[PDB]
Design an enzyme around this catalytic site. Structure first.
Site, short mmCIF file in Angstrom:
data_model
loop_
_atom_site.label_atom_id
_atom_site.label_comp_id
_atom_site.label_asym_id
_atom_site.label_seq_id
_atom_site.Cartn_x
_atom_site.Cartn_y
_atom_site.Cartn_z
N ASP A 21 0.72 -1.51 0.21
CA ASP A 21 -0.16 0.32 0.26
C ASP A 21 1.08 1.30 -0.37
OD1 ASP A 21 -2.87 -1.35 0.51
OD2 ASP A 21 -2.31 -1.78 2.11
N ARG A 35 7.11 6.50 -2.27
CA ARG A 35 6.26 5.98 -3.35
C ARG A 35 4.35 5.21 -2.71
NH1 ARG A 35 5.81 7.04 -7.67
NH2 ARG A 35 7.32 8.78 -6.13
N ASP A 40 -5.38 4.53 -10.63
CA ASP A 40 -6.08 3.33 -10.75
C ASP A 40 -6.00 2.69 -11.54
OD1 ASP A 40 -8.13 0.88 -9.41
OD2 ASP A 40 -9.06 1.63 -11.42
N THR A 41 -5.47 1.35 -12.34
CA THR A 41 -5.42 0.95 -13.35
C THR A 41 -6.44 0.52 -13.79
OG1 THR A 41 -3.83 0.22 -12.78
CG2 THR A 41 -3.21 1.79 -14.26
N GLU A 43 -6.90 -1.44 -16.50
CA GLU A 43 -6.57 -3.01 -17.00
C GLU A 43 -5.14 -2.95 -17.24
OE1 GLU A 43 -4.75 -1.70 -21.78
OE2 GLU A 43 -5.50 0.67 -20.79
N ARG A 87 8.39 14.66 -2.12
CA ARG A 87 8.65 13.12 -0.81
C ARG A 87 8.89 12.23 -0.99
NH1 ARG A 87 8.37 18.17 2.81
NH2 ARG A 87 6.64 17.67 3.05
#
EC number: 3.1.31.1
Length: 110
Positions: A21, A35, A40-41, A43, A87
């Site tokens: 997450d 990161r 939201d992908t 595919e 950051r």
């Protein structure tokens, strides 16, 4: 004209990295994340891999690289803390070695 490139090794270990997450580092009391949940992908977001290849897998490996393997440090004295992602990018050298190059370089999890 000429820029200064100096790297200061300072102890910096995550207090609780979920990986799957989000993750947060502990630098001078500043909550530096590494990161965050990208877009939201429709595919790409698969349940099997979850993120890249397996998901929790790469997370478990890193879960130890921060929990038990608390030998990470900040190798960069550029001074700039935000400019790339805000950051989200921080040099991580756990056990005198990088974690992103360990198993993350294999496509996260692999």
């Amino acid at each position: 004209a000429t820029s200064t490139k100096k790297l200061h090794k300072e102890p910096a270990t995550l207090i609780k990295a979920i990986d799957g997450d989000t993750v947060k580092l502990m630098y001078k009391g500043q909550p530096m994340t590494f990161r965050l949940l990208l877009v939201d992908t429709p595919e790409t977001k698969h349940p099997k891999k979850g993120v890249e290849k397996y998901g929790p897998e790469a997370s478990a490996f890193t879960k130890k690289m921060v929990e038990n393997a608390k030998k990470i440090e900040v190798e960069f004295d550029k001074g700039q803390r935000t400019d790339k992602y805000g950051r989200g990018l921080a040099y991580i050298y756990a056990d005198g070695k990088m974690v992103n190059e360990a198993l993350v370089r294999q496509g996260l999890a692999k």
